[PDB]
């Protein structure tokens, strides 16, 4: 089957087992609606996994986008993952409203220790500045800059200060545990 390392389908998680690490009766609902989630995971080694993050959110157009980045990431490759940046010359999405990126992440054991989960992080969005097109920006009914907070915080009574949970998946991406 594979002709080297890091090409093995056998370290890939069942997608049915990649799911929210927590649930809440109330999440933060500031800023445009979004759906932010992990859709796939692959075990690298130890507590390190490669994952696919999927982002969908009400947006302006690519031309209006100044910067779009994941920050606060607990990762062996560092805490920032820019997917678009006019300043830093990163051009890795086609549409701010719907995109995916891959992240290499550290994990911790979940409350069910058949699973692991990633650590909290933020997605920062910046529109309409610093060289971006201003076309449509006056009509935008939301702030030009904002953060989505991702995490399973220490809730009381099911009330979270985060917009969305972090995700969990089976330890080692095993199908059976």
Residue numbers in the entry: 16 to 192
Sentences from the paper on this structure:
Moreover, Flo11 confers the formation of diverse multicellular growth forms representing cooperative communities including biofilms, invasive filaments or adhesive aggregates. The structural and mutational analysis of different Flo11A domains demonstrates that homotypic Flo11A-Flo11A interactions depend on evolutionary conserved aromatic residues, which form two bands at the Flo11A surface.
Given our finding that Flo11A-mediated cellular adhesion appears to be well-conserved in Saccharomycetales, we wondered to which extent structures are conserved. Therefore, the crystal structure of Flo11A from K. pastoris (KpFlo11A), a variant from the family of Phaffomycetaceae, was determined at a resolution of 1.40 Å. The core motif of KpFlo11A, the FNIII domain, showed the highest degree of similarity (0.70 Å for 61 Cα atoms derived from the β-sheet), whereas the neck-like subdomain and the apical regions deviated from ScFlo11A. The surface of KpFlo11A exposed 6 tryptophans and nine tyrosines that cluster in two bands, which were similar but not identical to the aromatic bands of ScFlo11A. Also, both the KpFlo11A and ScFlo11A surfaces were quite rigid given the low thermal B factors found for their surface-exposed aromatic residues. Thus, the core and aromatic surface patterns of even highly divergent Flo11A domains appeared to be conserved, explaining the functional conservation with respect to cellular adhesion. Similar to ScFlo11A, KpFlo11A is able to undergo homophilic interactions with a KD of 31.8 µM. We also measured possible heterophilic interactions between ScFlo11A and KpFlo11A, where we found a clearly decreased interaction with a KD of 121.1 µM. Thus, both ScFlo11A and KpFlo11A are competent for efficient homophilic interactions in vitro, but they are able to clearly discriminate between each other.
